[PDB]
Amino acid sequence: DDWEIPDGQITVGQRIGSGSFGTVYKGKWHGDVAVKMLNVTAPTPQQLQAFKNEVGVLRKTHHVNILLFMGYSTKPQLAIVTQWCEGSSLYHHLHASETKFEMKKLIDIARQTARGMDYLHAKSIIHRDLKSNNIFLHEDNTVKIGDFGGSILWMAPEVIRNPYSFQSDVYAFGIVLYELMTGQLPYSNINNRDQIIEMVGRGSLSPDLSKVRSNCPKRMKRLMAECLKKKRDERPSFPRILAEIEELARE
Amino acid sequence: DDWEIPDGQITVGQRIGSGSFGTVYKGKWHGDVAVKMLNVTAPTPQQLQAFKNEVGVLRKTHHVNILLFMGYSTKPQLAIVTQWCEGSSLYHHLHASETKFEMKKLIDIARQTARGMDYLHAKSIIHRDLKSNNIFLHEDNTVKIGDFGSILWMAPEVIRMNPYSFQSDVYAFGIVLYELMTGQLPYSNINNRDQIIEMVGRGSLSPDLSKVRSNCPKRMKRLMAECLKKKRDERPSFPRILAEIEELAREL
Numbered sequence A: 001d002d003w004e005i006p007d008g009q010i011t012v013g014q015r016i017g018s019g020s021f022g023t024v025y026k027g028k029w030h031g032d033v034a035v036k037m038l039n040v041t042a043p044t045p046q047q048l049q050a051f052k053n054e055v056g057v058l059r060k061t062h063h064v065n066i067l068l069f070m071g072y073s074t075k076p077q078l079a080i081v082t083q084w085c086e087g088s089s090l091y092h093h094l095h096a097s098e099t100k101f102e103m104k105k106l107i108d109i110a111r112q113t114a115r116g117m118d119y120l121h122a123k124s125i126i127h128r129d130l131k132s133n134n135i136f137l138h139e140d141n142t143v144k145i146g147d148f149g150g151s152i153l154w155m156a157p158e159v160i161r162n163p164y165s166f167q168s169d170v171y172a173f174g175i176v177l178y179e180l181m182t183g184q185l186p187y188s189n190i191n192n193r194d195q196i197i198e199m200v201g202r203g204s205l206s207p208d209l210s211k212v213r214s215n216c217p218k219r220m221k222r223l224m225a226e227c228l229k230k231k232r233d234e235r236p237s238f239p240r241i242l243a244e245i246e247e248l249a250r251e
Numbered sequence B: 001d002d003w004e005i006p007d008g009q010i011t012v013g014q015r016i017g018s019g020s021f022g023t024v025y026k027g028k029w030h031g032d033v034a035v036k037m038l039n040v041t042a043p044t045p046q047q048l049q050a051f052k053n054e055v056g057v058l059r060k061t062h063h064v065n066i067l068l069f070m071g072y073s074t075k076p077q078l079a080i081v082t083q084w085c086e087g088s089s090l091y092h093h094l095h096a097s098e099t100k101f102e103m104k105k106l107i108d109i110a111r112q113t114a115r116g117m118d119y120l121h122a123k124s125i126i127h128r129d130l131k132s133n134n135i136f137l138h139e140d141n142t143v144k145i146g147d148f149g150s151i152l153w154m155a156p157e158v159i160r161m162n163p164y165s166f167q168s169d170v171y172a173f174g175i176v177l178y179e180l181m182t183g184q185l186p187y188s189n190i191n192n193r194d195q196i197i198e199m200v201g202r203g204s205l206s207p208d209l210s211k212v213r214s215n216c217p218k219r220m221k222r223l224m225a226e227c228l229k230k231k232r233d234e235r236p237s238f239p240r241i242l243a244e245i246e247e248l249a250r251e252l
């Protein structure tokens, strides 16, 4: 691969977010790009190491449902560059908007999400923060998985109490399925954070699966259940998860 | 960090086309993939080295309008894998289809095509076969540039014998603009190809820009003209080409 970007080529536009590592600016570089940037005139090794490692994982990714990693610049500032994403996240479309999706579109999102996730785990990568907030509907058609700039509902029980695993991401994908099939965040009636955190971690509290749509296929409900099994070992793997969802789509 | 894909991970079938050296299969690998394979023949040194270089450049490309490179396989056979492309090429949509595009989409395609090309040339890459056939409308919205003779896109200096340069690609992009802005293949009225080959090289034949669509903005007429200018040196560069297109689009 060739990942280093000539330095003076990037021009930063409107600041968008504060990111998880640096401030994020919608930029322009041979088209529309997004740039997470650090604006310190000289980077502390902490700041430098997060950069060095954040690039290290992205160096491995090449999938249509994973966000596109385009390169990095070291010298104007420590910067990471990716494609710009036209549209809104999965989170916004279900919760922060009136528009409900068609059941077909609902599974299609779950499908593409599975493909991106399957590919990630295949290259031995752990997301550690799968949520509808970190799932972007590029052009309202294509699912793009990333890490953008507080995730509690998608947290597996063993994470509440090396707890991050492939199975912890699987569970997180389960919660996302709930969002798609209910249009809702789990534990909507429980108010207090410590109550949810403790009840879900102790193994008493599990998402109310009766709220699923009528149109939701019975088989889809079963898969969603398996993903949310309290015992991490008893959770399915994304190969089978991807498998089942696609066979559903063909019908 | 390492792009080679272990054998039996990919499940092939649904072949689309077949060269004299290779075949393309709609595959399955963590989703929908496309696989170019060399299962037509034991690789000749040309094709085998062409393979080696084809991967070497794809390793370097990282763009939304450039085709997505996902990896390669050595052990079942020498294979290259990319994203699957949903839709049909620009060629098919303009000429081999009923669908006429809204002028907006013509510019959007023209802009995304420029972006992909600009990125390519920036990394010091020459395409050498820009045509509407090698431009794929993924999901009918997003342009994907790849490589899948064809002479309507052939620059004058290429007919005669570098000859292949960035300026030869610009001309080829010019013809594509003609396709987009006329809904037509150039010299549609001229019958025999052999006349065209000589005249385009000789300076006799020039695209008829009167066939341009009514909706086409004046700035587009000028840019399209400049791109297919006989003099290769005075031909614009894609940075400068892209520049006009974006600000043109920005005013709509």
Ligand SMILES: Cc1ccc(NC(=O)c2cccc(C(C)(C)C#N)c2)cc1Nc1ccc2ncn(C)c(=O)c2c1
Residues within 6 Å of the ligand: A016, A017, A024, A034, A035, A036, A054, A057, A058, A061, A067, A080, A081, A082, A083, A084, A085, A086, A125, A126, A127, A128, A145, A146, A147, A148
């Ligand atoms: C600009 C950027 C650079 C790097 C990352 N990094 C990650 O997402 C990350 C860091 C570590 C691991 C992963 C994995 C591979 C685990 C995933 N998924 C991802 C995010 C971003 N944010 C980013 C990227 C594109 C965007 N398009 C449109 N809009 C409006 C945005 O807000 C936006 C934000």
Ligand SMILES: Cc1ccc(NC(=O)c2cccc(C(C)(C)C#N)c2)cc1Nc1ccc2ncn(C)c(=O)c2c1
Residues within 6 Å of the ligand: B016, B024, B034, B035, B036, B054, B057, B058, B061, B066, B067, B080, B081, B082, B083, B084, B085, B086, B125, B126, B127, B145, B146, B147, B148
């Ligand atoms: C499977 C494959 C692998 C590699 C390449 N190679 C190139 O495009 C190529 C070869 C050399 C240079 C370049 C560059 C980098 C210059 C560009 N652009 C590209 C093409 C393909 N063909 C390919 C890829 C996706 C497809 N989706 C839908 N349909 C229906 C297709 O026919 C199809 C074909």
